[PDB]
Design a protein around this ligand. Structure first.
Ligand code: NA
Ligand code: NA
Lengths: 229, 225
């Protein structure tokens, strides 16, 4: 078919993030694993440039759609896309402050997916909860997957973050995933992928790092036909 | 006695929509019932000005949040608002198209809920998918509910409609539900309400007649560690 074939074993992945927040460059490298059947995976992320000038929380969606556990009967696009891979173009528009714009590419290196991401963060308030690291947790969410022309899928999401003063920071996530090949590919119908994300500190690592576990799984909701069933 | 105690019965409801779309005034008088434990209900939507001048599709959300089946661990704000009732302010932004701004009030009549809605449909493309009635299916969605201050909840959603050309027109839905009381009211934490709707264009006479079914229920999602 046959991308899903390749992902039937336990994979590794490596992430290279080249970023810019308010004219200030930063670099994040990450690695982790996803044991079959997937949909529950951990990543260790380190800031190469010493200290991250912002909250690690908004970085969560940067540090693997092919690792979400999909169901039998919904087509797993991210996985279909290999070996030739896929690009992602993504904007996160945070209400009353900055926009995160990223470009991703994914290559398959045996049982290792290599991810290369440039990210720009502009218009972020230097006093705000993101720059001042006042973000407490990442809200779970129901992202919405929509077929998009012949080579793409579109992921729309509301990503919310709890602040220190108990309020809420809301990002408008819009993410295009484009298949790199020219061959026809199966494009899944409208569905959902649920994403729950927790960021933790490992006492082991002295570096500016996070460990991050994501539980992600796809699902659909039964359409009604008057009765329906 | 307030809140969900009022909803422990079977119930009807009534909707009055005063609207306009790029000038064209229209009134809708929808009516329906919902049956304990609710979460699945029908509405009979009747235009009192004859022809609805745009698709009936984007009107789905206009034609009952208290009729969602809420599980036990999740506070049902829409119901807790009663008797005092609830007001709603709602914007829906269509990519490359117009914006529905609506304002709803709700009032309890023992076991009947009265809905009073105004809605401006503006900036809509005169030849686009909505005005040309080119939208086939209303896609289902997982609306996101968030606490919004001491007396409100915010509902965010992407409401997709499939077009004639087979593609999808996307609505960015932002709706603020505010308790109209001074009394203290529980605000639920972040959750979701799954909404599934099916629309049908019931036997046509001097008026646009429309039937709609909606399954709608609230849920949380897992948490880690
Ligand atoms: Na599919
Ligand atoms: Na609750």
């Amino acid at each position: 078919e046959g991308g899903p074939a390749l992902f039937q074993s336990d994979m590794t992945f490596k992430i290279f993030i080249d970023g810019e927040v308010n004219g200030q460059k930063f670099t994040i490298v990450a690695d982790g694993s996803s044991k079959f059947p997937h949909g529950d995976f951990n990543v260790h992320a380190v800031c190469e440039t010493g200290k991250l000038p912002m909250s690690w929380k908004p970085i969560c969606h940067l540090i693997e759609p092919f690792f979400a556990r999909y169901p039998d009967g919904i087509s797993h696009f991210a996985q279909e896309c290999f070996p030739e891979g896929l690009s992602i173009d993504r904007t996160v528009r945070f209400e009353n402050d900055g926009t995160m714009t990223s470009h991703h590419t994914y290559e398959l290196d045996d049982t290792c997916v290599v991810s290369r991401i440039t990210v720009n963060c502009d218009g972020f308030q230097p006093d705000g909860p993101i720059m001042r690291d006042q973000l407490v947790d990442i809200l779970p969410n129901e992202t919405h997957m929509f077929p998009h022309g012949p080579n793409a899928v579109r992921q729309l999401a509301f990503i919310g973050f709890t602040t220190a003063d108990g309020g809420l920071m809301m990002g408008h996530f819009d993410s295009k995933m484009t298949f790199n090949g020219s061959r026809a590919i199966e494009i899944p119908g409208p569905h959902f992928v649920t994403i729950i994300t927790k960021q933790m500190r490992d006492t082991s690592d002295k570096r500016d790092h996070v460990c991050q576990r994501e539980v992600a799984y796809a699902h659909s909701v039964p359409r009604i036909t008057s009765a329906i069933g």
